Design an enzyme around this catalytic site. Structure first.
Site, PDB file in Angstrom:
ATOM      1  N   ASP A  57       0.844  -1.194   0.000  1.00  0.00           N
ATOM      2  CA  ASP A  57       0.000   0.000   0.000  1.00  0.00           C
ATOM      3  C   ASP A  57       0.882   1.248   0.000  1.00  0.00           C
ATOM      4  OD1 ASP A  57      -2.873  -1.069   0.444  1.00  0.00           O
ATOM      5  OD2 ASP A  57      -1.764  -2.044   2.073  1.00  0.00           O
ATOM      6  N   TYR A  91       2.287   4.776   1.450  1.00  0.00           N
ATOM      7  CA  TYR A  91       2.380   5.334   2.791  1.00  0.00           C
ATOM      8  C   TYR A  91       1.110   6.096   3.128  1.00  0.00           C
ATOM      9  CZ  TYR A  91       7.482   4.599   2.576  1.00  0.00           C
ATOM     10  OH  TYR A  91       8.733   4.061   2.513  1.00  0.00           O
ATOM     11  N   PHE A 126       7.918   2.935  -1.753  1.00  0.00           N
ATOM     12  CA  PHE A 126       8.982   3.164  -0.780  1.00  0.00           C
ATOM     13  C   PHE A 126       9.519   4.592  -0.751  1.00  0.00           C
ATOM     14  CE2 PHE A 126       9.139  -1.473  -1.388  1.00  0.00           C
ATOM     15  CZ  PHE A 126       8.919  -1.841  -0.088  1.00  0.00           C
ATOM     16  N   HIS A 174      10.559  -8.402   4.137  1.00  0.00           N
ATOM     17  CA  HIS A 174      10.278  -6.990   3.923  1.00  0.00           C
ATOM     18  C   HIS A 174      11.254  -6.112   4.726  1.00  0.00           C
ATOM     19  CE1 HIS A 174       7.920  -3.234   3.965  1.00  0.00           C
ATOM     20  NE2 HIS A 174       7.284  -3.719   2.911  1.00  0.00           N
TER      21      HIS A 174
END
Ligand SMILES: [Cl-]
Ligand SMILES: [Cl-]
Ligand SMILES: [Cl-]
Length: 235
Positions: free
Chosen positions: A70, A72, A87, A196
């Site tokens: 998703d 941020y 990211f 992750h």
């Protein structure tokens, strides 16, 4: 903000061709009406530029695919963290913890210093497709926004991209991203898996995974120019 349909229509023809199975499907119009209705109702839906990752990295130019889940949902000094790249954060926003661990791995892999900022635009312009699998979010809400509709779209994207363009590098971090291998032939590509980079999982094997160096070895093996994983001093 442009309607979602107008944002699909503004994509380059090569991306529109890759998304056509989704745009022709029964899920397209409902996704567009949902996102547009959320904005029309006054909700803070981010990012405004939903397909920035695709506009900055055209299909022929894709070298590395890095999946997020998703966008941020947070902010920094009143600036939303989500700006259309997985990211990445826009200029003026501090790197969040997952991105700091990405930078730690690059610094260890190559000896580079920790960057001053977290804008990954210059990786996108080199062929790094920074693709969240869900491409909108509601401010301050961790709930996935239009999760099922968006994942039909990005599932189509991954399959069609990978079928049309061989020898991509996929960096699949976390189980959700790794399950996307169902969408392509992993013998035709370089599939790099690790936990992750979030602090919850990074010390399970993200730190130490060497993915950025492995990716460049595979690119050079196939005659392509490697990625410069540095970031310029200003965003
Ligand atoms: Cl056109
Ligand atoms: Cl076609
Ligand atoms: Cl459908």
């Amino acid at each position: 903000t442009p309607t979602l349909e107008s944002q699909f229509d503004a994509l380059p023809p090569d991306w529109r061709a890759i998304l056509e199975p989704f745009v022709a499907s029964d899920a397209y119009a409902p996704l567009c009406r949902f996102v547009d209705g959320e904005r029309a109702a006054g909700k803070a839906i981010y990012p405004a530029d939903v397909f920035r990752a695709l506009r900055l990295t055209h299909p022929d130019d894709v070298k590395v695919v890095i999946l997020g889940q998703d966008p941020y949902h947070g902010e920094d000094r009143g600036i939303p963290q989500a700006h259309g790249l997985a990211f990445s954060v826009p200029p003026g926003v501090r790197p969040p913890p997952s991105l700091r661990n990405i930078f730690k791995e690059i610094s260890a892999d190559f000896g580079y210093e920790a960057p001053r900022h977290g804008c990954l635009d210059t990786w996108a312009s080199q062929g790094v497709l920074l693709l969240n699998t869900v491409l909108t979010v509601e401010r301050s809400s961790a709930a996935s926004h239009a999760k099922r509709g968006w994942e039909k779209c990005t599932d189509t994207l991954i399959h069609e991209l990978a079928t049309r363009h061989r020898h991509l590098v996929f960096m699949l971090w976390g189980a959700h991203a790794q399950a996307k291998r169902a969408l392509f032939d992993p013998r035709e590509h370089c599939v790099l898996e690790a936990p992750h980079p979030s602090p919850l999982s990074a010390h399970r094997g993200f730190l130490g995974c060497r993915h950025f160096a492995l990716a460049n070895d595979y690119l050079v093996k196939h005659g392509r120019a490697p990625i410069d994983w540095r970031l310029p001093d200003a965003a």
